[PDB]
């Protein structure tokens, strides 16, 4: 059987990559950061409580101005908040209430959303009439929309439960490039700072680094034991962190092509739903199923703080571009700003 | 300058919450339902009798609004997207009475899911007329696929329909007890299963959901007062 030889040759290549990564593992991240001083006890406080959502909140995204933010709740509403004054700027009724992700364009002129409808809907916020209307409905995915991120006003990358990711041309509404490497539901994606690459996390316990313009899977990262639910790039773009149902957070390096650190504790037995780094990348914030958010030391793997304000599962979190505050969404229909 | 901009934001905020108040009474008044089942379980026939990733079906019973959703273009991996239906009033699980063992395993996963622990399940044991034809024939026996059926006896609490063979009654109630054994194992008084012997062309399926939903809302209010 030629397939059995292809099964045999695959094991040879996986054994070659494993030994190639072992040769580069001279010293671990803990040994390098063994002499640096710890960050200490991080005690953030809830400064704002955003109230108005009628159902569980699934996703949120900060604007580039670090003031406005959009939130997606399964009641069929997209709300744009002014985090400074807690005032609602826009309330967008959705055609499908089963939204699972939302995005804020870097220019602040558009917002995106999607979910079980398998459609990524683009909404125009800067219409001269003064209302917010859908400008484009991106269809073509055969699974639920799990995450979406704007590259610019005309390009957006999406992840879907059909095990594929896609690059969309908003003007034409057609898929420019399709990424078909994963074997399970792709749950989240994270764009590089220069938007040349992006990483995705799927339900195959593996993460993949993609080339946006080339459309190829450059590196595949393994080490997790369960489905990866969240992913976030390091501020420098040379590393990223993942959150999975195995109650562990892991840090992977692109140039090293292997895992550097694992963030877990024996008292944590619930899966991670969202991950994000601080501005400097020293702190790794992660949302958990146990209604709590844990602040990890990205260099020493030490838990530095706990954000316990929500009454239900924390589904999403995000740090502002200026690093001033951290937002947290949860299934209790509330958003909380932490400083 | 600074006074005109902030005041324009406050008037825009109070206009939004004014609309959100109208959306709240509409959202809280309708009861959302999730329809689940195999491709040949008969759920599609119940929808028409009352591409896209999810279908919507809105019916009204005694001026009470219901919003039943049907899963469309989604893959067979359900462990992720099924978490979105944790706040629905009930999950309508349609089973074609070894496809039966596969439905029993799916029911066990839904019943024991961490996020679905507080969601009741309306069990529609569909295709009761097709089950009777197979039991009366005697060619396809159940005990070869369920050895405990040979030693199974019809419960005296059963309500057989007038003019029905006892072999059909013992067969359909054995399948019901297979689902009830899973529900009564981890019920914990948080959620309950409502089994029903239904057909695809039954007009009573709407009334069964309305009566079961009324019982679910009643048990929720009784739990908030810690009466049950």
């Amino acid at each position: 059987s030629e397939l059995d030889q292809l099964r045999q040759e695959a094991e040879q290549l996986k054994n070659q990559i494993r030994d190639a990564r072992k040769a580069c593992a001279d010293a671990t991240l803990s040994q390098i950061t063994n002499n640096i001083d710890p960050v200490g006890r991080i005690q953030m406080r809830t400064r704002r409580t955003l109230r108005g959502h009628l159902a569980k909140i699934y996703a949120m995204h900060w604007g580039t101005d670090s003031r406005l933010l959009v939130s997606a709740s399964q009641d069929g509403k997209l709300i744009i908040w002014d985090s400074y004054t807690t005032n609602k700027v826009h309330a967008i009724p959705l055609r499908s209430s089963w939204v699972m992700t939302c995005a804020y364009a870097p220019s602040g002129n558009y917002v995106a959303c999607g979910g079980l409808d398998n459609i990524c809907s683009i909404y125009n916020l800067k219409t001269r009439e003064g209302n917010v209307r859908v400008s484009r409905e991106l269809a073509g995915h055969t699974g639920y929309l799990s995450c979406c991120r704007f590259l610019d006003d005309n390009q957006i990358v999406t992840s879907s439960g059909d095990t594929t990711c896609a690059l969309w041309d908003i003007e034409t509404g057609q898929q420019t490039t399709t990424f078909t490497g994963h074997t399970g539901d792709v749950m989240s994606l994270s764009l590089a700072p220069d938007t040349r690459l992006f990483v995705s996390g799927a339900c195959d316990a593996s993460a993949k680094l993609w080339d946006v313009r080339e459309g190829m899977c450059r590196q595949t990262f393994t080490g997790h034991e369960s489905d990866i639910n969240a992913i976030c790039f390091f501020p420098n773009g040379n590393a990223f962190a993942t959150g999975s149902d195995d109650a562990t957070c892991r840090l992977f390096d692109l140039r090293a092509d292997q895992e550097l650190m694992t963030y877990s504790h024996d008292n944590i037995i619930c899966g991670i739903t969202s991950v994000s780094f601080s501005k400097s990348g020293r702190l790794l914030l992660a949302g958990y199923d146990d209604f709590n958010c844990n602040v990890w030391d990205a260099l020493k793997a030490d838990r530095a703080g706990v954000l316990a304000g929500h009454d239900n599962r924390v589904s999403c979190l995000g740090v502002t571009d200026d690093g001033m505050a951290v937002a947290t969404g949860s299934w209790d229909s509330f958003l909380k700003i932490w400083n | 300058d600074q006074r005109n901009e902030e005041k324009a934001q406050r008037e825009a905020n109070k206009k939004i919450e004014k609309q959100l108040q109208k959306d709240k009474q509409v959202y809280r008044a309708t009861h959302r339902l999730l329809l689940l089942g195999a491709g040949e379980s008969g759920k599609n026939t119940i929808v028409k009798q009352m591409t896209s990733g999810i279908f919507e079906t809105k019916f009204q019973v005694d001026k009470v609004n219901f919003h039943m959703f049907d899963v469309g273009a989604q893959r067979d991996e359900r462990r992720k997207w099924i978490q979105c239906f944790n706040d629905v009033t009930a999950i309508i699980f349609v089973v074609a009475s070894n496809r039966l063992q596969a439905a029993l395993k799916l029911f066990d996963s839904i019943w024991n899911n961490k996020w679905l622990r507080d969601t009741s399940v309306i069990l529609f044991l569909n295709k009761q007329d097709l089950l009777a034809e197979k039991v009366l024939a005697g060619k396809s026996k159940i005990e070869d696929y369920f050895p405990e059926f040979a030693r199974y006896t019809t419960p005296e609490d059963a309500t057989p329909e007038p003019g029905e063979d006892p072999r059909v009654t013992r067969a359909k109630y054995f399948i019901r007890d297979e689902f009830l054994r899973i529900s009564t194992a981890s019920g914990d008084g948080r959620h309950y299963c409502y089994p029903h012997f239904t057909c695809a062309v039954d007009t009573e399926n709407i009334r069964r959901v309305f009566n079961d939903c009324r019982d679910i809302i009643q048990r929720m209010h009784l739990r908030q007062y810690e009466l049950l």
């Epitope: 095990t163 074997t183 399970g184 339900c203 195959d204 316990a205 393994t222 034991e225 369960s226 489905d227 149902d245 195995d246 109650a247 037995i269 899966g271 | 893959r75 067979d76 991996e77 359900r78 462990r79 099924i82 596969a102 395993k105 066990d108 996963s109 839904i110 019943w111 024991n112 899911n113 961490k114 981890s186």
Partner: nanobody
Framework: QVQLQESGGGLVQPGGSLRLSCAAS????????MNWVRQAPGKGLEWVSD????????SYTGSVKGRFTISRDNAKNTLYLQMNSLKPEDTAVYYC?????????????????????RGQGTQVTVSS
């Protein structure tokens, strides 16, 4: 890297006996519930049996109850399936399927056509 490799099995006489083994690696074997699934020629994937994390909770499908025996060795990270009184109906490719999430009583999607936490399977043929 989650890896599941099935071993044992093959051609056997009707009424014979076989012992399947699944070597698990890349995850904490003691924290996951294990399953056995099979796919007959021209048929879909079918759940056969499962075993809890510790091994107290054990269930089988109706067709193999009394003939098949499932067990696990947490120290060796190995899943076992003792098949006795094999019939020609048992001819199928047998896969060892792990539940997707640890410390969970539910086990979703283990019979889906494309499941990540499932081995490549081993061929078991029962014929005279």
């Amino acid at each position: 890297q989650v890896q599941l490799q099935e071993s044992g099995g093959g051609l056997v006489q009707p009424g014979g006996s076989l012992r399947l083994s699944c070597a698990a690696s890349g995850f904490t074997f003691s924290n996951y519930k294990m399953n056995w699934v099979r796919q007959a020629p021209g048929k879909g994937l079918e759940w056969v049996s499962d075993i809890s994390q510790s091994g107290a909770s054990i269930s089988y499908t109706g067709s193999v109850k009394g003939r098949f025996t499932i067990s696990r060795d947490n120290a060796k990270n190995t899943l076992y399936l003792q098949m006795n009184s094999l019939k020609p109906e048992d001819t199928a490719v047998y896969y060892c399927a792990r539940c997707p999430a640890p410390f969970t009583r539910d086990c979703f999607d283990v019979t889906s056509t494309t499941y990540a936490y499932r081995g490549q399977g081993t061929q078991v043929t029962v014929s005279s």
